[PDB]
Design a protein around this ligand. Structure first.
Ligand SMILES: Nc1ncnc2c1ncn2[C@@H]1O[C@H](COP(=O)(O)OP(=O)(O)OP(=O)(O)O)[C@@H](O)[C@H]1O
Ligand SMILES: Nc1ncnc2c1ncn2[C@@H]1O[C@H](COP(=O)(O)OP(=O)(O)OP(=O)(O)O)[C@@H](O)[C@H]1O
Ligand SMILES: [Mg+2]
Ligand SMILES: [Mg+2]
Lengths: 165, 257, 14, 257
DNA sequence: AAAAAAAAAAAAAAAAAAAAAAAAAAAA
DNA sequence: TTTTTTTTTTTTTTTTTTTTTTTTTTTT
């Protein structure tokens, strides 16, 4: 029989302050090698989670998919709740904005950048990117980011911060 | 009822230290630190599987509240005609990791992620010859990619399978063999079994020449047969209200084998 | 003669 | 603990510029500039994988401030029964870009884009006989489409696979073979290994006639065995507090092989 | 007040083949 | 009276491959 005094488990990650949901779930899927359907399956909440990765949130199933999923990612309902805009505010969609100046501190994405009113970073004092400055492509969901490398134009991403502001 | 308590005991299982077992434990340890793969061979009733259990238990897995465990030794047993998917699945389950549907390459990527991080030093594969010939590609891959010693355990047929492929023969060339009981060793065993396993109030005094003749012919040196036979003899004997094992009841049991 | 450590090459990798 | 520090070292790996290795590196270079495909053959313990790896590392990927890395040599190893999708996926990962989800034609189109632009001159495929017979269509395709030399590395079986298809045999007709150690070459190796790998305080002095007999019988010319054997002998020897490898401990190890 | 175009998970279907297995046959 | 040695079908498998049915999520 299998080994004694253990329980079922998976690999856990820690959120960063301000971290967005789509981003967080992506890290999780990568750390544990699985599909969104897979997450939804371990979870028992259906296929619904895949559009979360591209920011579509009709609901806040706070006591349903969201109270439930804490048990898989080991993060509580409230910390998780904080990974989405408060009811009624924010709600930007198509361009994905980024301040690479913060990447020197931590690769991440900060969800505040996707509230409709934003165009500047106050913490680093500057114009937020809404498009890549070199190849002039829009960016892919935070959810699908790899190693802090640009496919369109490889650089350190962080290396880009001297320019544009 | 006193008698029922005793019958339930005899019906069960236990581990008795023996020389064969000690030898293996020290040999494997050498191999574990040296990180070298090897195989263990011997006849099917020598008690190879049990020595391997006794070993596993001497190294308690450790666990903290949050991060993943440290599991120095992993022991698995394959199913007949084991494929590449079946091997990864069993490795992943033995560590109580949650996983479901995916393709072979996906179980492979996952197997290397759970084997890493989690301290694993040795993998032991029982019934080793149930592996399909292609799976050895995955067994070698792990052994060479990760600092993990792989031990193959089996009967003489295992070597007949291995010699069919030079790539495998060479990684697993070193070996240890289990043997049978004989002479003074069979006699001392019998005596240990009486004091350490049977324990009847009446004292049997088995080592007697006329009794070892019965057992020797009946068991032919296999520890497997020796155990079954003396246990069937104490249980039958007690059910009949006797306080010891005599010559005739032992012969009555041995005759059925 | 130069001899290399096996993991070193990885540590110095491009 | 001084002893622990040393055991950990001995348990590791290193690359020694042997005579066999120097030749391959020059041969491949010829092939690289000439841009021609070829194959390398030899027995499984001759150290083919290591000679080929050592080569890869002598040509570090280069990087400018703007464009993608230039990567002259790509080294990959397939899984067993490798399919057409599996080959592209590994080439794409090797070059640090990952595309996920699509069909076979999509992996192919993407493989040609990363192989282009990024300078690639040579592709090395280890254990080439893990390839499924149809995948060679994709290996030839790349070799003919892009000015990339493809090298197939493997055992005698590789040629049994290749000779079953004229289309492949002809692109990959040229070959180099690895051999075994012998005569003066086996002796010179032994001596190098003592000074370059073991490094005990007290010279064990193995090239001595009496000791080489033990090693020759034990190793039969494979560099693989020679390395395992001398390392297992220094580790066992130190664990017992000895300052050198002697005759009896070497025989104690060799007996197990 | 309400409808439309779609990205994706899911679903039979073929689908070609690598390998183990089942006979057939020839001599000393 | 056994020992290879050759040919051959029946099956079993694991991709993969294209495809419809559905359910959705938002915008004036
Ligand atoms: N150290 C031991 N203590 C007690 N019983 C033992 C010991 N070793 C072997 N046995 C006996 O052998 C049996 C276990 O099977 P055993 O190891 O003899 O065969 P095995 O090698 O597991 O068979 P196979 O290799 O074919 O799976 C038990 O019933 C037990 O009575
Ligand atoms: N230059 C070298 N220095 C030290 N050891 C070497 C060298 N070349 C080969 N080896 C030995 O060979 C082993 C590495 O595998 P090897 O070089 O045999 O690859 P390979 O021959 O391609 O194996 P296979 O063909 O079975 O896949 C190491 O354990 C090492 O001891
Ligand atoms: Mg067993
Ligand atoms: Mg190799």
């Amino acid at each position: 029989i299998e080994a004694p005094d253990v329980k079922p488990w998976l690999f856990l990650i820690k959120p960063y302050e301000g971290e967005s949901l789509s981003h967080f779930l992506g890290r999780f899927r990568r750390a544990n090698h699985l599909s969104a359907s897979g997450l939804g399956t371990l979870a028992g909440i259906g296929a619904i989670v895949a559009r979360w990765e591209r920011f579509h949130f009709n609901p806040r199933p706070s006591q349903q998919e969201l109270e439930a999923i804490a048990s898989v990612v080991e993060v509580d309902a409230q910390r998780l709740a904080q990974m989405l805009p408060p009811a009624g505010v924010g709600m930007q969609h198509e361009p994905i904005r980024l301040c690479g100046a913060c990447y020197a501190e931590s690769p991440c994405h900060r969800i505040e950048w996707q509230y409709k009113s934003v165009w500047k970073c106050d913490r680093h004092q500057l114009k937020i990117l809404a498009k890549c400055p070199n190849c002039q492509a829009p960016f892919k969901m935070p959810a699908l980011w790899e190693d802090g490398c640009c496919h369109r134009c490889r650089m350190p991403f962080a290396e880009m911060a001297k320019l544009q502001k | 009822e006193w008698l029922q308590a005793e019958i339930a005991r005899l019906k069960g299982k236990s581990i008795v230290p023996l020389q064969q077992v000690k030898t293996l434990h020290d040999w494997l340890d050498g191999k574990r630190k040296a990180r070298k793969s090897c195989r263990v061979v011997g006849e099917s009733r020598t008690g190879k599987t049990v020595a391997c259990d006794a070993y596993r238990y001497r190294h308690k897995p450790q666990q903290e509240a949050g991060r993943p465990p440290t599991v120095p030794v992993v022991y698995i047993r394959p199913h007949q005609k084991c494929g590449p998917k079946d091997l990864f699945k069993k490795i992943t389950e033995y560590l109580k990791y949650r996983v479901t549907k995916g393709t072979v390459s996906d179980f492979r990527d996952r197997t290397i992620e759970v084997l890493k991080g989690c301290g694993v030093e040795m993998l032991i594969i029982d019934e080793a010859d149930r592996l399909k010939p292609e799976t050895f590609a995955d067994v070698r891959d792990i052994a060479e990619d990760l600092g993990i010693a792989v031990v193959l355990v089996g009967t003489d047929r295992l070597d007949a399978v291995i010699k069919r492929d030079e790539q495998v023969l060479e990684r697993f060339r070193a070996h240890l063999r289990f043997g049978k009981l004989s002479g003074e060793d069979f006699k001392n065993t019998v005596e240990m079994w009486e004091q350490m396993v049977l324990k009847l109030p009446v004292s049997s005094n088995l080592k007697s020449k006329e009794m070892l003749r019965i057992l020797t012919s009946a068991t032919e040196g296999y520890i497997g047969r020796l155990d079954e036979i003396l246990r069937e003899a104490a249980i039958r004997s007690l059910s009949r209200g006797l306080k010891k094992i005599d010559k005739a009841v032992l012969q009555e049991v041995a005759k059925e084998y | 003669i130069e001899v290399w450590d096996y993991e070193q090459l990885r540590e110095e990798y491009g």
